[PDB]
Amino acid sequence: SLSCDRNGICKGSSGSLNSIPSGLTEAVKSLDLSNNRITYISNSDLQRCVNLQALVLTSNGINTIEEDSFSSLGSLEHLDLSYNYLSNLSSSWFKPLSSLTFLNLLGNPYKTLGETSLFSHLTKLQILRVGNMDTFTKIQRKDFAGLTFLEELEIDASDLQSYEPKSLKSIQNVSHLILHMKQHILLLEIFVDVTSSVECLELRDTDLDTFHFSELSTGETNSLIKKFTFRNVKITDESLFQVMKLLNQISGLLELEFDDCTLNGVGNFRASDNDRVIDPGKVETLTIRRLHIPRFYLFYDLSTLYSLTERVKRITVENSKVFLVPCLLSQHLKSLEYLDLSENLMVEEYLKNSACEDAWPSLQTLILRQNHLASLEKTGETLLTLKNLTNIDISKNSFHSMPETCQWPEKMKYLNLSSTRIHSVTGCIPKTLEILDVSNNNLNLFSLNLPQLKELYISRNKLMTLPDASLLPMLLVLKISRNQLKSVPDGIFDRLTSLQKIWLHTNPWDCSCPRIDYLSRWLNKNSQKEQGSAKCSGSGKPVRSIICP
Amino acid sequence: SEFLVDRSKNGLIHVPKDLSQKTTILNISQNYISELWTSDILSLSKLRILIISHNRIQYLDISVFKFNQELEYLDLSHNKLVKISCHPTVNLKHLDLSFNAFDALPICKEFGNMSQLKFLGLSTTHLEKSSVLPIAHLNISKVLLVLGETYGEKEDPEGLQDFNTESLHIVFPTNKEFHFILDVSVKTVANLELSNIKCVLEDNKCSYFLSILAKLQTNPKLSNLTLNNIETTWNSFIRILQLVWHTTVWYFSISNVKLQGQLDFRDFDYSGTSLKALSIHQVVSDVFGFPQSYIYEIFSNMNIKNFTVSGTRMVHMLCPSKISPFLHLDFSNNLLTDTVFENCGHLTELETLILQMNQLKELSKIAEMTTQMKSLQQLDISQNSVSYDEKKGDCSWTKSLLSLNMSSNILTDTIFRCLPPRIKVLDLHSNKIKSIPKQVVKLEALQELNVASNQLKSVPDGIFDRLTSLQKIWLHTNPWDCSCPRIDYLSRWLNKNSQKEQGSAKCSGSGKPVRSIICP
Amino acid sequence: XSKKKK
Numbered sequence A: 001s002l003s004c005d006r007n008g009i010c011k012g013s014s015g016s017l018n019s020i021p022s023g024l025t026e027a028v029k030s031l032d033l034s035n036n037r038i039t040y041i042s043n044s045d046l047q048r049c050v051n052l053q054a055l056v057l058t059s060n061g062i063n064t065i066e067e068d069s070f071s072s073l074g075s076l077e078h079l080d081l082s083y084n085y086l087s088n089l090s091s092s093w094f095k096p097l098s099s100l101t102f103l104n105l106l107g108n109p110y111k112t113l114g115e116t117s118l119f120s121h122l123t124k125l126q127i128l129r130v131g132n133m134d135t136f137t138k139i140q141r142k143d144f145a146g147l148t149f150l151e152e153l154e155i156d157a158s159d160l161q162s163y164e165p166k167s168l169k170s171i172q173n174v175s176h177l178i179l180h181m182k183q184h185i186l187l188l189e190i191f192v193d194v195t196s197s198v199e200c201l202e203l204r205d206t207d208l209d210t211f212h213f214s215e216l217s218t219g220e221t222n223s224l225i226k227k228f229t230f231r232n233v234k235i236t237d238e239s240l241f242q243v244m245k246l247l248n249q250i251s252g253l254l255e256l257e258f259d260d261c262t263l264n265g266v267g268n269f270r271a272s273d274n275d276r277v278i279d280p281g282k283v284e285t286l287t288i289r290r291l292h293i294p295r296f297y298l299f300y301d302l303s304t305l306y307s308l309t310e311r312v313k314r315i316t317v318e319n320s321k322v323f324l325v326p327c328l329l330s331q332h333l334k335s336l337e338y339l340d341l342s343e344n345l346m347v348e349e350y351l352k353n354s355a356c357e358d359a360w361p362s363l364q365t366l367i368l369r370q371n372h373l374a375s376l377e378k379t380g381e382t383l384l385t386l387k388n389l390t391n392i393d394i395s396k397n398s399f400h401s402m403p404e405t406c407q408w409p410e411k412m413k414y415l416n417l418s419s420t421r422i423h424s425v426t427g428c429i430p431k432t433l434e435i436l437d438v439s440n441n442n443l444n445l446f447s448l449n450l451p452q453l454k455e456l457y458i459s460r461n462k463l464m465t466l467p468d469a470s471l472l473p474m475l476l477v478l479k480i481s482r483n484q485l486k487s488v489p490d491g492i493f494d495r496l497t498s499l500q501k502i503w504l505h506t507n508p509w510d511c512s513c514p515r516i517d518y519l520s521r522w523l524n525k526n527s528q529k530e531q532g533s534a535k536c537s538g539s540g541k542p543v544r545s546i547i548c549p
Numbered sequence B: 001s002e003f004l005v006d007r008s009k010n011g012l013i014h015v016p017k018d019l020s021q022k023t024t025i026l027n028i029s030q031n032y033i034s035e036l037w038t039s040d041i042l043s044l045s046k047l048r049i050l051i052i053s054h055n056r057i058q059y060l061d062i063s064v065f066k067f068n069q070e071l072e073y074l075d076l077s078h079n080k081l082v083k084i085s086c087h088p089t090v091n092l093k094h095l096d097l098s099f100n101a102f103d104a105l106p107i108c109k110e111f112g113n114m115s116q117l118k119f120l121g122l123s124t125t126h127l128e129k130s131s132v133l134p135i136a137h138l139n140i141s142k143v144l145l146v147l148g149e150t151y152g153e154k155e156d157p158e159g160l161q162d163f164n165t166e167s168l169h170i171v172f173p174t175n176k177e178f179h180f181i182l183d184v185s186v187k188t189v190a191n192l193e194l195s196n197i198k199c200v201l202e203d204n205k206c207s208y209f210l211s212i213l214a215k216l217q218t219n220p221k222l223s224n225l226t227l228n229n230i231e232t233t234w235n236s237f238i239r240i241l242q243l244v245w246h247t248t249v250w251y252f253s254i255s256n257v258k259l260q261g262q263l264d265f266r267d268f269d270y271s272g273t274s275l276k277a278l279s280i281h282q283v284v285s286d287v288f289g290f291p292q293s294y295i296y297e298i299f300s301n302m303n304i305k306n307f308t309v310s311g312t313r314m315v316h317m318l319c320p321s322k323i324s325p326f327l328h329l330d331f332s333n334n335l336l337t338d339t340v341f342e343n344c345g346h347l348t349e350l351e352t353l354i355l356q357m358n359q360l361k362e363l364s365k366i367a368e369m370t371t372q373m374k375s376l377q378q379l380d381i382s383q384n385s386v387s388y389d390e391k392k393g394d395c396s397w398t399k400s401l402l403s404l405n406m407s408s409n410i411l412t413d414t415i416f417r418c419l420p421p422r423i424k425v426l427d428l429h430s431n432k433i434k435s436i437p438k439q440v441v442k443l444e445a446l447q448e449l450n451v452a453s454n455q456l457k458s459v460p461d462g463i464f465d466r467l468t469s470l471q472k473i474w475l476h477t478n479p480w481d482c483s484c485p486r487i488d489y490l491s492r493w494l495n496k497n498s499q500k501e502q503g504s505a506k507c508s509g510s511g512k513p514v515r516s517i518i519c520p
Numbered sequence C: 001x002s003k004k005k006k
């Protein structure tokens, strides 16, 4: 039923294995029992496999597993028992394991880990995914005892009803802690015991409306948390402030993230309470992706947050219906260096107001990829107020053309005009450019004087002729693949004296002898430089290897 | 025997000479001509239409056309005419003297003999009611009157009263606050159009303009009203709307609007209207601090059948507060998202809805918006960024939908798992469809299917056999794999059902029409 | 861009 590879890596092909084969070949190191009709697992069906370390039992329907069956594997590492029906675990299986690294028991009917200190002799694991979004409702100290160090710890406690104190204060260090929890009842008490032990905390599926913060007696012990992520969380204007008070308990916090959350409010937040006012702390990066706001069209100007804007250096607010970043707010974000407003509702008139005089004074990178911009000239003129702007990504915006001349920030170095629907390129493109991307357009030719351009991406266009190399002396990278290029001037690549990479594949290279002698010969010694492999229009035979009489 | 000579945009400084005597239409528009001599055109005995607009003629002797007895259309608009010498002319049907430099109305007593005059274009910086008397007996179809930039001093309110037209278009001065008292309510006008209107002073906001609009209530003949190039405050804009609402107009059009200020006037009275259709195009607004809902509420509760709003930055639209009479809505080219009209049960009479060129993304949500639109028959969500997540399950489309346009989006073949039952017209061109699943056969009513410009390489054998209602299909601009043991069915079907195929599906690489491939 | 009313 298997199709093992030449290294002992057996694949569970025909998914219908009623159980584990009779005494498998011991020279096996890996297996594949993903999605197979299984229900029983004993020691007399995988006995002669002490050299097996890769066990994957993903979704089989395993009801019962006879004990003493993991000793027959001895040194097992990647141990997977994902989405099965093992509703009653036992420290017996976590006894034979000597060299374990990945233990996943997510998706099983069990609702507890037993009051018999589970996970013990497997004192070598770094990743442990325990829990199920169905019935797991208890976590006692009698869990996570035989492990003090691990990289990633994921606990699917969706319906967590009770958390025994200090059931997590045991583990000393956890680089990434992922927690699934619908209600916020036991959130503060799970926090107090992990705050000094975790580096990157992640909360999922929690309804934080009505979440209230109360000064927890966790002590003046500094938090180890530097990154706090909230995923698919529900928050209101008031609770968001409460969350802020909690974040101020992590003075070392540097990065805040919100993925696919819902804000049931209009942004009428309070920046202070009656006791402690929210402190910006050391948070330097804020990442918000797909934030659902029912009344987005009614959102406030955020002036209630001006006191938390002076220090942040990187901001991402993606696909969240942003139609305006108020001028006053943009003027307060005095340290902002990187701003990504991709997939929003930005148009020229409002980008002008967002980027008013003195707005985002330190900004060097602005990303407006999938918005609603239509005029290159006006988009460029609008950014002139950002004196230190050097990187602009306005790809996936429907500019259809560009005038002969345009105004752009003085120090423009990177301009992304990919999937922009342009038919030609003109002097509008700034001369100071170092990296230009005009891929995925309708370009027929390219003849721009860009003296210091190091990278040109112009793939997926309709270029008959190669881009003028005599105007791109410093050209290091050149992606010209997928372009309808048939011939090419002789000695043209002698111009690019520093060329390092080049894409030429997917072009109708006419390999007739009285023409390709140069190109077909250039691709020889210049092998490391070529990316992929150009072919002949009349034969799949590569052009790099064909010389003429 | 229509002979045409077009020498427009040729940079001509003189009327081109030596032209065919067959010439019936001469177009020398957009040049640098400054004079028109009898000798320039006396040989063109068959000249019926002469276009010399956008030139620099300062004086024109009308006797210069005495040898062009066939002339019926003369366009001298956009020149520098300050004087016209009157002499009996031909019986023109169209005379355009608009956009010139005349001080007084250029009406010759001779024009009174132009019994077939349908269109009359004029210009003035000064207008006297009497100067129109010469053409008062003429039943003119349309009159266009451009008021010079210095129009205003010593103004006569009754200036327009003697005009006898069905349609009238007044072009007021540009770059000047509206302080005119000229009464635009003319006895015979059914279709009125007014252009350049500016009143950006909140204090005494458009009192002058609103006053002339008020006088339109007394004109029962007024059926259509068009306003162009408006620059005003949000309050005044809403007042203009309110005032027109109580007139006898059936068709109201507004285009090119610049708005500023804060909207305070929210109390709109929709009673006593005769409006059948309202369209608003190209609106730009300054940033503001009042809730956007103030704007949306006003428009969402309008008691009219036809409503169009295009070329604005509107990011949302609310559901009407009560069962709405909206029948056809065109909201193309704005910034609307998936939640437009969400949680609605009041668009039960809506038959047509256009949402082309907005910011739509999730098809499931769009289908739900549709659930309570029990009368919806046509829906256009083309030119957006719509994709469908099959993990969302079955869509909730109303069963009344008959025509669905989803072209120019990013849909895949999963789209066939989310389609209205009785669908007749389905346009899916320019998407990311890589195959046509078996689910398509369930579309028993499908008459027109357009899957051009996608990524189809082949279709399952017999795929179209159960589409008995099919009459038109687009399959072109797809990378069809014409290797024989695979393209057999399609090539045969495309050959026998030749009348149904729109355009011509062709083979990838080969370039030959699929219809012409023969397999063994 | 609603302005806080107070």
Ligand SMILES: *C[C@@H](COC(=O)CCCCCCCCCCCCCCC)OC(=O)CCCCCCCCCCCCCCC
Residues within 6 Å of the ligand: A244, A247, A256, A279, A280, A281, A283, A286, A291, A293, A296, A297, A299, A300, A301, A302, A305, A308, A309, A312, A315, A317, A320, A321, A322, A323, A324, A325, A326, A329, C001, C002
């Ligand atoms: C009226 C507009 C205005 O929306 C915007 O201005 C665009 C948002 C860009 C600015 C985000 C605010 C940056 C805050 C920095 C905080 C630094 C860290 C402080 C310590 C933790 O509304 C719209 O156009 C429609 C809605 C667009 C999305 C609006 C969501 C923005 C919500 C900001 C919440 C920040 C919470 C930070 C503390 C946890």
Ligand SMILES: *[C@@H]1O[C@H](CO)[C@@H](O[C@@H]2O[C@H](CO)[C@@H](O[C@@H]3O[C@H](CO)[C@@H](O)[C@H](O)[C@@H]3O)[C@H](O)[C@H]2NC(C)=O)[C@H](O)[C@H]1NC(C)=O
Residues within 6 Å of the ligand: B356, B380, B382, B383, B405, B406, B407, B408, B425, B427
């Ligand atoms: C669905 O909506 C789209 C609009 O997004 C309609 O497509 C548009 O249809 C018009 C008329 O067929 C196309 O015009 C054509 O333009 C070309 C080039 O300018 C010209 O050569 C043709 O003679 C014709 O005038 C237009 O290109 C096309 N637009 C897009 C974006 O594809 C479509 O017709 C609607 N479908 C239905 C069923 O109504």
Ligand SMILES: *[C@@H]1O[C@H](CO)[C@@H](O[C@@H]2O[C@H](CO)[C@@H](O[C@H]3O[C@H](CO)[C@@H](O)[C@H](O)[C@@H]3O)[C@H](O)[C@H]2NC(C)=O)[C@H](O)[C@H]1NC(C)=O
Residues within 6 Å of the ligand: B276, B277, B306, B328, B352
């Ligand atoms: C209210 O909005 C309606 C748009 O949905 C609009 O109906 C449309 O009217 C046009 C006529 O301009 C019809 O198109 C016609 O085009 C030519 C005419 O020469 C012919 O092929 C046919 O006569 C064809 O009907 C559209 O078919 C029609 N759309 C629908 C679905 O009714 C109304 O006219 C608008 N009413 C007002 C008062 O503005």
Ligand SMILES: *[C@@H]1O[C@H](CO)[C@@H](O[C@H]2O[C@H](CO)[C@@H](O[C@H]3O[C@H](CO)[C@@H](O)[C@H](O)[C@@H]3O)[C@H](O)[C@H]2NC(C)=O)[C@H](O)[C@H]1NC(C)=O
Residues within 6 Å of the ligand: B006, B008, B009, B027, B029, B030, B051
């Ligand atoms: C005499 O010659 C004129 C100039 O060549 C003609 O003009 C017209 O040209 C086209 C076709 O009618 C149109 O151009 C405009 O189209 C839209 C609408 O304005 C815009 O994209 C843009 O404003 C274009 O300029 C106009 O109808 C008109 N444009 C110009 C150049 O004035 C004119 O039609 C012709 N007359 C005859 C009857 O032959």
Ligand SMILES: *C(=O)CCCCCCCCCCCCCCC
Residues within 6 Å of the ligand: A297, A299, A323, A324, A350, B280, B283, B285, B286, B287, B288, B289, B292, B295, B299, B309, B312, B313, B314, B315, C001, C002
């Ligand atoms: C907060 O929303 C402050 C204002 C943000 C700029 C305005 C964006 C919406 C513009 C609406 C324009 C409506 C035009 C008329 C539609 C009928």
Ligand SMILES: *[C@@H]1O[C@H](CO)[C@@H](O)[C@H](O)[C@H]1NC(C)=O
Residues within 6 Å of the ligand: A361, A362, A364, A387, A388
């Ligand atoms: C621009 O960025 C550089 C980063 O090297 C920084 O040193 C400089 O201060 C910035 N310019 C200003 C003051 O905007």
Ligand SMILES: *[C@@H]1O[C@H](CO)[C@@H](O)[C@H](O)[C@H]1NC(C)=O
Residues within 6 Å of the ligand: A369, A393, A395, A396, A416, A417, A418, A419, A435, A436, A437, A457
């Ligand atoms: C330009 O943007 C596109 C997405 O629109 C991205 O895939 C590409 O990597 C960018 N180009 C460069 C050189 O970063």
Ligand SMILES: *[C@@H]1O[C@H](CO)[C@@H](O)[C@H](O)[C@H]1NC(C)=O
Residues within 6 Å of the ligand: B137, B138, B139
């Ligand atoms: C104008 O129309 C009226 C009404 O049909 C008619 O009585 C009158 O004679 C017409 N005048 C002319 C000659 O245009």
Ligand SMILES: *[C@H]1O[C@H](CO)[C@@H](O)[C@H](O)[C@H]1NC(C)=O
Residues within 6 Å of the ligand: A172, A173, A224
């Ligand atoms: C635990 O060890 C890690 C090793 O990377 C270290 O970064 C962290 O500060 C330690 N936490 C404490 C204080 O126990």
